[PDB]
């Protein structure tokens, strides 16, 4: 199979053409180093990109669609999980034990009537 | 090439109407592309329940306008003859292009 982008997190969906090769991340035919290579928090979004530990020999071209940056990272990670179960099912148990096969269903709670935010209530005067 | 945009407030009426049009094209025997769904327009109205005073207690309404486009490949004269009051459902508005 060709290992591809699967899965969702926040408001994202993964489109990674991950393939055997030296892993240098290219986004929209442009480099990590041109886009945000020396950005801080790039490393801590790229660590869930690596956290499936099948990135050590895999070249990454990442054009994950939609949503914020950490959600895009979770979509990429979930895609490598689902593609590696599509490759071989013995390592399903170890991704389950580490806790990466779980999609994080946490999402933005809605605004509400008589209230500024999802839970945030007007400041109440006792008098 | 016949481009029929049929829109209603109820999805059961929508599915009945689009199955009728697909049935008409199937009865005349032409290549039919599937009825695609176009996204529902959730028009939300937030309306005060109390006649005199409230701000926290208020109820919200929605009108949902559904949309499918059938986009049949081949129209024909037998279908043009058979179009006369073929839809026959008051809930659905149908829009036509050539």
């Amino acid at each position: 199979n060709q290992y591809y982008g699967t899965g969702r997190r926040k408001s994202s969906a993964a489109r990674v053409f991950i393939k055997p090769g030296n892993g240098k991340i290219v986004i929209n035919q442009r480099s990590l180093e041109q886009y945000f290579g020396r950005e801080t928090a790039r490393m801590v979004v790229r660590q869930p990109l690596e956290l499936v530990d099948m990135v050590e020999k895999l070249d990454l071209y990442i054009t994950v669609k939609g949503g914020g940056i950490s959600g895009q990272a979770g979509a990429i990670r979930h895609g490598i999980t689902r593609a590696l179960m599509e490759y071989d099912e013995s390592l399903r148990s170890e991704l389950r034990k580490a806790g990466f096969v779980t999609r994080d269903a946490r999402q933005v709670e809605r605004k509400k009537v008589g209230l500024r935010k999802a839970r945030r209530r007007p400041q109440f005067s006792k008098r | 090439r016949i481009r029929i945009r049929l829109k209603a407030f109820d999805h059961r009426l929508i599915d009945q109407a689009t199955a009728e049009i697909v049935e008409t094209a199937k009865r005349t025997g032409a290549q039919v592309r599937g009825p695609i769904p176009l996204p529902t327009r959730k028009e939300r109205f937030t309306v005060l329940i109390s006649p005199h005073v409230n701000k926290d207690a208020r109820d919200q309404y929605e009108i949902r306008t559904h949309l499918r486009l059938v986009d049949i490949v081949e129209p024909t004269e037998k279908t043009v003859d058979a179009l006369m009051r073929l839809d026959l459902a008051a809930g659905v508005d149908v829009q036509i292009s050539l």
């Binding site: 809605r110 | 407030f9 109820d10 028009e43 939300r44 109205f45 309306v47 005060l48 329940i49 006649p51 109820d59 919200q60 309404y61 929605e62 009108i63 949902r64 306008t65 809930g91």
Partner: protein, 96 residues
């Protein structure tokens, strides 16, 4: 109740939409200069109710100024009543 405002709103609707909205629009585009003024004076000599500024868009079964919604065409209380009774097609309560 409030029949004076009903006939006042009917008055500004008929004075804006029917007698005018062509004479006023032509005088407006004459008033903006394209390359004391006659268009400003003549738009003054037109009656003031002809202006679409004047119309307060108001409820049809009652006449409440506020809580009017243009799409339904009635006051807030009346669209609640017709929604809960089923007169308005497709109007269901929102719960997302």
């Amino acid at each position: 109740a409030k029949q004076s405002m009903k006939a006042r709103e009917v008055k500004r609707v008929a004075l804006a939409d029917k007698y005018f909205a062509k004479r006023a629009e032509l005088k407006a585009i004459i008033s903006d200069v394209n390359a004391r003024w006659n268009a400003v004076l003549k738009l003054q000599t037109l009656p003031r109710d002809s202006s679409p500024s004047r119309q307060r868009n108001r409820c049809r079964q009652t006449g409440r100024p506020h809580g009017f919604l243009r799409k339904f065409g009635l006051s807030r209380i009346k669209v609640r009543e017709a929604a809960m009774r089923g007169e308005i097609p497709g109007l269901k309560k929102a719960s997302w």
